[PDB]
């Protein structure tokens, strides 16, 4: 009553009477109880499956292999799923065995049952629309599933880049706010030469801007797809025109410029695109983490630190230390970046585990990439909104570090040479006397020329000799 009985290769099984999924999905629900992450939590992934199934059905219809009415109803069911309906009917664990077969069959069963309803039949009456013979016609998991992954990740990358662009813009705006803050550059954490905080924050923006092209060019690799490979890449049970026509139909339906891999036998076990895209995310996370490490260091203080900048105060720092406020927003970003790096290692193991004509470890690989994308979007939005936008500088503290530095002696090299500048630098360190006073003390340069050479505003760019 509350169930219907379905059957497959394994035998008979009860399915909830109103479920749009069928017996093979039910088995996968039962078999893989690993995580709290399920396909229903990934709307772009479900949408991509619906794109794939709509394209395959349209191609089968155009090639004379699928009845016009069944195609019409598969397309309507796919349109509904694309529009956001029935996603609760996709309940399997993102960490699952079977190499994606359980997700492909989940799509086949849900679409078949909705198409049956549109034909005036009841769920489970697969004699009128078969998950295998109609919704999966001319397909395998081993092309439909990776093609769905690739379109989903291509689309998710668009959203990752969008949040990255907003973060970049936040750094550029803050660089303009801070453009007149002269401060001391540091290399190896030792005093170097002067710079502006505008230069430093524009450098944050510009190194992150480089990641746009890295993320986009590697996500473009996902557009090479293998529809028509069927089981292992030979195209067994596909029509000679199907691979090209299905790929063209899929490009039009999805709006992604998918193209057909030139060797489908090569493509079917190929996980390289996922590896290098995960690596591009790792590269960006390494840069983001470094930037956050810099921010926590420059905000150190208030009395025993560098104290060049102030981060927005978002919560009390300490249960015991009164008045303390900690850089909690860069800290949570660092932690996300470490998770991304670890997830990238998971991807590497999964990719290296492929065997012969298929890699069966793509579920955890996809789960890890999608988790990294989600966490990175959230970390970047948090960093932008609750930290970068409201940063201020301690301008006088920074300027006094420059005025009292020895490193400005570097600007004298073109005039007195490195040996003589070193003599001045050593004496400044040993005695505490200023570089400026020592140069005049030793009568190395006129005051008029020295005033130009040691002006901090004159050390921010290359210049001809004064």
């Amino acid at each position: 009553n509350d169930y219907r009985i379905e059957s497959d290769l394994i035998g008979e099984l009860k399915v909830p009477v109103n479920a749009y999924y069928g017996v093979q999905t039910q088995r996968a629900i039962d078999n893989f109880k690993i995580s709290n992450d399920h396909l229903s939590d990934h709307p772009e992934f479900i949408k991509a499956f619906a794109f794939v199934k709509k394209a395959a059905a349209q191609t089968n219809f155009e090639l004379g292999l699928l009845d016009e009415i069944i195609n019409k109803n598969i397309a309507t069911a796919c349109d509904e799923i694309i529009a956001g309906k029935m996603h609760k009917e996709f309940p399997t664990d993102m960490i699952q065995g079977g190499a994606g077969t359980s997700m492909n069959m989940n799509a086949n069963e849900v679409i078949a049952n909705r198409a049956l309803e549109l034909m005036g039949h009841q769920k489970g009456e697969y004699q009128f629309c078969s998950p295998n013979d109609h919704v999966n016609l001319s397909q395998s998991t081993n092309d439909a599933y990776p093609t769905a992954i690739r379109i989903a990740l291509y689309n998710l990358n668009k959203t990752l880049v969008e949040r990255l662009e907003l973060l970049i813009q936040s750094f550029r705006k803050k660089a303009d706010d801070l453009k007149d803050v002269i401060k001391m550059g540091r290399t190896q954490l030792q005093d170097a030469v002067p710079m502006t905080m505008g230069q430093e924050f524009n450098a944050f923006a510009n190194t992150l801007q480089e990641e746009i092209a890295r993320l986009n060019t590697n996500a473009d690799l996902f557009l090479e797809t293998n529809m028509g490979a069927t089981a292992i890449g030979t195209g067994l049970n596909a029509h000679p025109d199907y691979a090209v026509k299905c790929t063209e139909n899929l490009a039009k339906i999805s709006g992604a410029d998918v193209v057909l891999a030139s060797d489908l036998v090569e493509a079917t076990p190929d996980t390289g695109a996922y590896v290098i895209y995960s690596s591009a995310m790792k590269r960006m996370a390494v840069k983001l983490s470094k930037i956050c490490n810099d921010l926590r260091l420059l905000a150190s203080g208030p009395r025993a630190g560098l104290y060049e900048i102030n981060l927005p105060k978002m919560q009390p720092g300490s249960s015991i230390m009164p008045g303390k406020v900690n850089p909690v927003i860069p800290e949570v970003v660092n932690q996300v970046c470490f998770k991304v790096i670890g997830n990238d290692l998971t991807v590497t193991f999964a990719a290296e585990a492929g065997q012969l004509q298929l890699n069966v470890m793509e579920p955890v690989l996809t789960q890890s990439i999608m988790e990294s994308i989600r966490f990175l979007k959230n970390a970047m939005d948090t960093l932008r909104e609750k930290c970068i936008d409201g940063i201020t500088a301690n301008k006088e503290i920074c300027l006094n570090m420059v005025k009292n530095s020895i490193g400005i002696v570097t600007a004298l090299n073109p005039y007195i040479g490195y040996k003589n500048s070193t003599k001045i630098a050593k004496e400044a360190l040993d005695t505490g006397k200023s570089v400026y006073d020592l140069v005049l003390e030793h009568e190395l340069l006129s005051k008029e020329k020295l005033d130009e050479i040691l002006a901090p505003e004159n050390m921010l760019n290359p210049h001809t000799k004064f």
Copy 2:
């Protein structure tokens, strides 16, 4: 109406009127929206915080620092949390900035507000029970929080070892079922010498049994705790007798044999125990993955593989290939193992990121360890129940591999020497003739002696020559 107004260092903030948490927890909820994993999902972690707060209050009372009535009501509130109540009042993200302060203050606020109710006051009337001055008395996040992590992970390790032991026993029972199945060992995937499946499956059990002592001895490192360190390990604001007395009280309350670190300045930034415990989980996951790789290989077939064993058939293998059934249960375990390995790298980055008197990256480190423990328990239960318990062998296929192998010639080395055995082996490979027939043709041993040495049952143990 639906809110009350609380205040902290940052300012005033609305808090849901019936929440047991307070302003600092609310800020953390607002500040860290990263993941779908929250403290409320980790009962052992919440319970450990309640142990710590009950022990600290009891110690403060015994030292004359805390009123008897406030101690009594803190204790009652902690007892309720230990018993499983009010866990929904702990809603912050497991990936959070602030180095744990938001979890410590969440415990301080919830316990204070419950103690206030027991005193006949209203939530937020902190003048009668202060989150900082009473519930956090003599403490910092920087001892209460890592002590809670360590007790929680020590207790979660017990559950991990319990599920591992059930899996070990499943392998032992299956080894007994298969004890008479003689088969070919393989090294470097080349034919080696005979063995039994009893030997092979007991070896699975025995290598996993070795992980019990590794997990337990590394989890024992968590018992070294730092109560009394307060902010950085100096014990500022603690009574001289507090560190020893609080640790003793915590051992009695928690039932874990916690001991006091001999150098609290050393202990406060120390993440080494988490690193090596995570590594012990990684080692066990590597072993589990290798075993699952073996099972998928020995189950290969049915007509073009090794086909030594049959795994329970848990779902149809293929949307296109009829009759195919895949080793989906070992596959999902492999994937969990890869996730554990990646999470262990996240732990390594977090640990290496410590600075001076504190490591602020413990939230994601703990999140990753707890995720690995949960996934491993689920993977081991799944492997046991849906695969190991029901394995069968193809006994005649295995025996015929032994009888037809060349590698059994190895058993003749003590009688005819390696050069002569090599001559037999080369001729067997080149001609397709059997080792047995070739030895008799060359008349290197009597038929009666050869019948003994090359009997499959006599090639499984050391033996005396005759």
Copy 3:
């Protein structure tokens, strides 16, 4: 006597009297005794330093900043180093502190002392040619050193791709050798559908061919260089026209199409190019390892394995098992691939450790990438010469696997539907009767049609329905 005395900021120090390096190189020799890997072992790295110093000197002269005669002798010294002379004068550890300053100063000292000789002076008479004021004029380590790394790695990538392409061609030739070997595809290690070994080995070639563009496009990122950044990217002490002119001169001198980074402040701490290039090497190593895993599996045997292929026999397999021969060449490649993956993690830690205006961890990062390139070239040559070129197939063994398989039932789906094909497949497994015989016993298809559908030669490509 056998020494000369030189001095620097630290003080006076003995240098071997005939060494071309000077005091700062001697200090680095003394300070960093870590590994057996020294700069003298990396000719492309030394050559790149000479390119950089020649280009900088040419530019300084073209800007009127360096005497034409001193430029001429610096150029001659650089030409000698480029031609392969004096590489023993570069003896520092590849794992060294100082962020590359010790390598930059080694180049400055060697070139100065050779220029001094060409001018009729003695080594160490730096008053006539200064390592700092002449050979390092307008430069810092922080542009000369990464520019040298990037040119060296760009050139080393050419050699890596060259050896990869030889290996690819070896797979293509072997694919043609084996084009008529029909065999069983396998997914999830279960029998799938037929393919040819030509298809499988061409897929090996084609997946590796995809790595050419990945390695090349990521190595092209090295061409963005930062000459003119000087200490931190501000261009302090450089002429305004120097950065563009030096980059153009460097492109002409090196033959590499280097271009000037648009933000030198961004570029100076930027390690992203190394991270993603190392990741591209990792991706290729993961593919190579998978292919080697496949070869070891397909070569398993001779009597208890798959035994589809024979690898050239390169040494006795066993000290105890007579006649055994193991897949030692794929095995050593696997091991190199694991080393590449580990070295890639070292690169990731080094990159994430950058601080403010410089990343000081580039020596071990460069050491690790260069070690991976060298090991991979050796592994690929070994795999090609001692394995791939001589592979043969066991043609009858493979053909009989196809003839006796159940998986050919897949070809019936378009004619009888998946339900009926499943019934046939299950009966074939349960009874051992052939798929062909069962189809006729069920009167599903005529013999004439069945003979065409189930011909394995008709399963290797898509085709219209018979």
Copy 4:
């Protein structure tokens, strides 16, 4: 003339006429040209092989299986190798295929040929002492080789711990030098509460002291050995008393307390001990790296940093910035630590690649562990001798940070409560007035009590309330 011809399963091959190795070693030299790291570079590894062969021969003699004269001469040859002779006769690459067979046969061939000379025969006259039938009697590579690895790593761990202990003592001595340097603790890089630099450097010593037990207890796992396993753990061809007797003889000969694994089938593919030992090295490297990061931060300066400590000046910091000196010794240690972490990932991949009755990836696993041991010993020696021993503090700079801090307000909590302390802290930050002056201004505590509570020397330990 300059060659002799030897024979094996593959065929005949020339060997250098005076080489103690034989044909199978020559093949391995020819087959594996990967790295510049050869067995001859690892004396403890060669020594361990000689222990193993001497113990096996003595046991075979005691069991009546080996002639007394052959045993005597094998023992003498092993003694010479143990004493350091003939190590140049072990020339194979540490990265090699064949799973260790090439190293086992190298030992068999060298020992056989030296035994032949002691018997008055010529090299290669194996009819009087057979590498396979005598020197390898009752053995496989698959017990002799891992037993040699395990004894070698057990002995190398002793040297690693020795160098760690020297470094620990260097930190303890320096802590005593700095015991009176009061300074500001920092958490999350924000001002925390006071400590002494003696506390901080003793914490360095004490956290490293914890690594001694981790390294030793994990190296003790190597003492479980598998002599008597022969090919796969079944003991085929061994006498039933051999495994126990050989292990006892090996313990006496080697001086290492080896014990017999209780399940030799389990032990033969078991790589878990290597994984967790490498993880213990990784944990120590993570701690060492953190300490070095701390040192580089505390040494930042001289005018724009924290400048708490001075590191010995070991070389000029910069080719351009005069007077600059960088923390190059902690930097090189950081880089070694990153290399150790990457090598640990190589170990993990190698371990997870085991298949059925053997793991063939142990050569690169062992190569990576031995590289990490060597690099870590050199890094620790360098850190001790060229940095820690000569550190000094800037005592007045540190004391003024404490005196001018706001964080000392924490000490007021037991007297005025956290809310009142927060009011003082916020007013100090906003106005720049001192915590001390504000407390007296607001008349919160008497000057007599305040002079005690806020004395820096009274904040370094727990105390009873003043």
